[PDB]
Amino acid sequence: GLEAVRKRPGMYIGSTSERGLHHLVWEIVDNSIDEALAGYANQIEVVIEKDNWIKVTDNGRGIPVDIQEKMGRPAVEVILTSSVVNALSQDLEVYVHRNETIYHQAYKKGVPQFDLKEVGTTDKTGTVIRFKADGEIFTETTVYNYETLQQRIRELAFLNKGIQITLRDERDEENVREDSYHYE
Numbered sequence: 589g590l591e592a593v594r595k596r597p598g599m600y601i602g603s604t605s606e607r608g609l610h611h612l613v614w615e616i617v618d619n620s621i622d623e624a625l626a627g628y629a630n631q632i633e634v635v636i637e638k639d640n641w642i643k644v645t646d647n648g649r650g651i652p653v654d655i656q657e658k659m660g661r662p663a664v665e666v667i668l669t670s671s672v673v674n675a676l677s678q679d680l681e682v683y684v685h686r687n688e689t690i691y692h693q694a695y696k697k698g699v700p701q702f703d704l705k706e707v708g709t710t711d712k713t714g715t716v717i718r719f720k721a722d723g724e725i726f727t728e729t730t731v732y733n734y735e736t737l738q739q740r741i742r743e744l745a746f747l748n749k750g751i752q753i754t755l756r757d758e759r760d761e762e763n764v765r766e767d768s769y770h771y772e
């Protein structure tokens with residue numbers, strides 16, 4: 589049902605301009621805040637990578653992977669194929685650390701490029717998400733802005749005392765810059 593979303597993305601997101609670009613980030617970030625609020629996440633990271641991809645990482649429990657009873661498809665796929673961010677992203681990747689394992693799947697405009705598969709072992713838990721906005725949609729600007737992301741990270745941490753939130757800009761490879769907030 590993400591096919592409508594790439595037709596009238598105005599209800600879902602509101603304006604395809606620069607402010608709609610930065611709202612993708614708060615979508616994913618909301619999820620890690622949930623994991624914090626439930627009592628399992630305490631650490632969260634945001635990076636703007638080269639070519640303006642975006643990476644969010646937390647140490648919560650990891651998205652559920654168990655197979656569902658309606659179609660035999662994993663929980664994590666059923667969930668992402670309903671994601672606004674995923675629909676309006678031209679590429680998107682996910683890594684999950686769960687059951688002592690590292691699972692992985694990868695999309696185009698919300699269409700799964702292959703079945704969830706196992707790619708390693710772990711003794712951690714958590715989720716990683718990387719995505720790259722669909723330019724044919726966000727015509728105007730595909731460049732993120734540090735100050736804007738930075739101000740909002742700072743309010744979120746002050747709103748969630750005890751939780752370490754970090755931002756980093758890796759676009760200028762020779763000059764890497766970082767801020768980390770952790771209110772007692």
Ligand SMILES: CSc1cc(-c2sc(-c3cccs3)nc2C)[nH]n1
Binds near residue numbers: 616623644652667717
């Ligand atoms: C950074 S994206 C992300 C997604 C999630 C989780 S954790 C979860 C769980 C549901 C039930 C038990 S853990 N669901 C999602 C979507 N955390 N971080």
